Structure 1
Amino acid sequence: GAPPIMGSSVYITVELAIAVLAILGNVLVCWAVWLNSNLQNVTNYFVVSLAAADIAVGVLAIPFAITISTGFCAACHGCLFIACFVLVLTQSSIFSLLAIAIDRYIAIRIPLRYNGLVTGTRAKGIIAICWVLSFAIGLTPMLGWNNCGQPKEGKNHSQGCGEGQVACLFEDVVPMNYMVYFNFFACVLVPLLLMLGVYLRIFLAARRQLADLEDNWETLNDNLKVIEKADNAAQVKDALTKMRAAALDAQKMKDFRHGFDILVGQIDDALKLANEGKVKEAQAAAEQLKTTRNAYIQKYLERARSTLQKEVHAAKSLAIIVGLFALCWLPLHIINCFTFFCPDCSHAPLWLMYLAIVLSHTNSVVNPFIYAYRIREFRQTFRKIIRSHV
């Protein structure tokens, strides 16, 4: 086989390239949120926590990955810290992605309660708790779920390690049952399936809200046509009963309120005429509603639709981030499943292990590109920072 330094040189060069780009792009994200008060909202506090975890991949996890590739002699607990630190950063990423999804689900489900429920102060406390939990989950092997008690004595003596020392190789110190059942199934796949569930629920909520606005609108217009081609008070009365219910529903901001006030008032004016049997006076009064609709109600309808469409576009952008996380991490998890569940299978070759490691690290480069492409407020801020400060 080719001298191992040759494959190592390629691996290390690739890891350093990824580290440089992870740091630069994620620093830009943080700098943008810092500069632009329009980016300073609770959603973007989780974006910043996620960017911090990605900067720590370039600054720490990649140098650790380079180190552990050598199989250097180390105290087994020092070795575990180097092997497991990236699991803390990845767990922190999962908590941030889950928080973003739930945040967007609260914003679309109860918009009026959002600002008083989801505050900056609460977000900061959740981020701190999530970072503590990420340390506890990713460094669980350091608590004694590890192979330090069953060292590879042949590798230890071949590499010349001292006493209490092991050849520091990931799959010699970190148990595969930890990596498959605890890390992958419980701590990554369950949260990814939950996020999939939350985004589903966001898109279902948006679609139901957009459908309800269109139905209210159509109830308005159809009942207007019922009233026109009507032939007695009872008919005009029944339609105006529908319209009034529909109009109070659409209502649920001074220029807005004046609109629904006029409309409801006109509906009651025409209701009083109908109840008095005055059918043509009722119909004339109902014809008035058309100018209230054209001048106020169509404006509110188009603004509510535009807000919901923006929320759908934003939820697609954030879900793409989750999909790219899944694409970059699953290969390594799936290889661990083959290693663990298929002892009769040939182990994935080294070149494939290193490709899957590098792919996982590339995930710390991509988020700044998704933001620049998909989110106008980020792209415009990145442009200002690059033109001005470079």
Structure 2
Amino acid sequence: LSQQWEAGMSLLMALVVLLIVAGNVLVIAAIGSTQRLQTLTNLFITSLACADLVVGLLVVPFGATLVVRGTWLWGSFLCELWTSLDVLCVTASVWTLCVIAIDRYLAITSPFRYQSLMTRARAKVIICTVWAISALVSFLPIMMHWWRDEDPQALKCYQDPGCCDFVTNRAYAIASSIISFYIPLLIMIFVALRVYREAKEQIRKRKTSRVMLMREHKALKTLGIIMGVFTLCWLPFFLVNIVNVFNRDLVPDWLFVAFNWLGYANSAMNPIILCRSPDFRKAFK
């Protein structure tokens, strides 16, 4: 019966991996093989797609084996690397959504300046800075063991190469969550709502035709959907992560894991969402 669950979950995880990996390669292949999709925003989309791709190839396969076997098979170093890449992908994603919100705000409010000043190369530089800072804030604290808790349970997990539970002290949990999630999430939401407001005002009345503005706003809508779904997928985990560092009995471990898998599931959603945008649909066809 445990073999039926092992075999059953194994196959379900293979399909999740295939969906995340294939989905996010297509998105990147759609963008790179099509003139229409060579926009600055879609270079920022490529960063999200890269983060979702790392999740599909490195994070989810290691995670699947932990869920199905109930122990960590890959030793203490790969536990630490796995955790660092997991943290990196979430951080780079939410900061990239924050860059997209800000970019688009400046694009609608100063289209004249924006278009003379922003270039394809300058977008890549911003993306690099995001991933470089994300890697700093992600890898450094994990390398330095700033996250470790002093409880016997925690210490036993650290002595055991078979335990890869990210048991953390409250200082690290609150601080890392603020820098890597809550701050960029709040900036993204605040700025996106203003973009929504300003787009909404421009159609109501730019010299631009009203039908051209509606085509601009369909693309803006895709981004807000990605933004909204990212929030739904990750905000539960991060709220529960805080509750769990204050009291471990308030959140059972299996429930913690379920919330985590809702987060990983976001990596599968974006290609499917991008599929319903008009230009991306043609490209996939």
- TM-score of the aligned structures, taking structure 1 as reference length: 0.65
Match of residue 178 from structure 1: 172
Change (3 A) 1:100 1:64: same
2: CA distance, partners of 1:154 / 1:13: 34
Deviation at 1:44, TM superposition (A): 0.6
Match of residue 282 from structure 2: 380
User: What is the DSSP-based 3-state SS (H/G/I as helix, E as strand, rest coil) of the residue aligned with 1:108?
Assistant: helix
Bigger Cα displacement from structure 2, 351-360 vs 63-72: 63-72
Match of residue 52 from structure 1: 50
2: CA distance, partners of 1:333 / 1:205: 30
Q: How many residues align?
A: 282
Match of residue 242 from structure 2: 337
Q: 2:216 matched to 1:311?
A: yes
Which residue, out of 188, 191, 207, partners 1:198? 191
The higher radius of gyration belongs to 1
CA-to-aligned-CA distance 1:335-373 (integer Å, 9 cap, x gap): 2122123x2x72433432332222111111111111111
1: CA distance, partners of 2:169 / 2:18: 31
CA-to-aligned-CA distance 1:241-296 (integer Å, 9 cap, x gap): xxxxxxxxx8xxxxxxxxxxxxxxxxxxxxxxxxxxxxxxxxxxxxxxxxxxxxxx
1: CA distance, partners of 2:80 / 2:231: 25
2: CA distance, partners of 1:73 / 1:27: 29
Which residue, out of 258, 261, 285, partners 1:355? 258
1:211-226 equivalences in 2 (<5 Å): 211=204, 213=205
CA-to-aligned-CA distance 1:82-133 (integer Å, 9 cap, x gap): 2231110111111221222122112211111122222111111111111111
2: CA distance, partners of 1:125 / 1:105: 19
Match of residue 239 from structure 1: none
2: CA distance, partners of 1:35 / 1:66: 33
Change (3 A) 1:356 1:17: farther
- TM-score of the aligned structures, taking structure 2 as reference length: 0.86
Match of residue 97 from structure 2: 97
Q: Which runs of 5+ in 2 are unaligned?
A: none
Taking only aligned residues, the RMSD between alpha carbons, in angstroms, comes to: 2.8
Amino acid at match of 2:144: L
2: CA distance, partners of 1:7 / 1:347: 27
User: What is the DSSP-based 3-state SS (H/G/I as helix, E as strand, rest coil) of the residue aligned with 1:137?
Assistant: helix
User: What is the DSSP-based 3-state SS (H/G/I as helix, E as strand, rest coil) of the residue aligned with 1:183?
Assistant: helix
Change (3 A) 1:73 1:210: closer
CA-to-aligned-CA distance 1:3-62 (integer Å, 9 cap, x gap): 6x6665555443332111001111100111111011112111111111111111111011
User: What is the DSSP-based 3-state SS (H/G/I as helix, E as strand, rest coil) of the residue aligned with 1:38?
Assistant: coil
2: CA distance, partners of 1:80 / 1:176: 19
Match of residue 17 from structure 2: 19
Deviation at 1:165, TM superposition (A): 4.9
Q: Percent identity?
A: 32
Deviation at 1:167, TM superposition (A): 3.4
Bigger Cα displacement from structure 2, 35-44 vs 347-356: 347-356
Match of residue 258 from structure 1: none
Task: Indicate conservation of the 8 Å contact 1:14/1:358, yes or no.
Answer: no
Match of residue 135 from structure 2: 135
Change (3 A) 1:207 1:319: closer
Bigger Cα displacement from structure 2, 99-108 vs 42-51: 99-108
Relative contact order higher in (CA < 8 Å, ≥ 6 apart): 2
User: What is the DSSP-based 3-state SS (H/G/I as helix, E as strand, rest coil) of the residue aligned with 2:166?
Assistant: helix
Which residue, out of 367, 370, 382, partners 2:270? 367
Change (3 A) 1:10 1:85: farther
Amino acid at match of 1:311: E
Task: Indicate conservation of the 8 Å contact 1:11/1:354, yes or no.
Answer: no
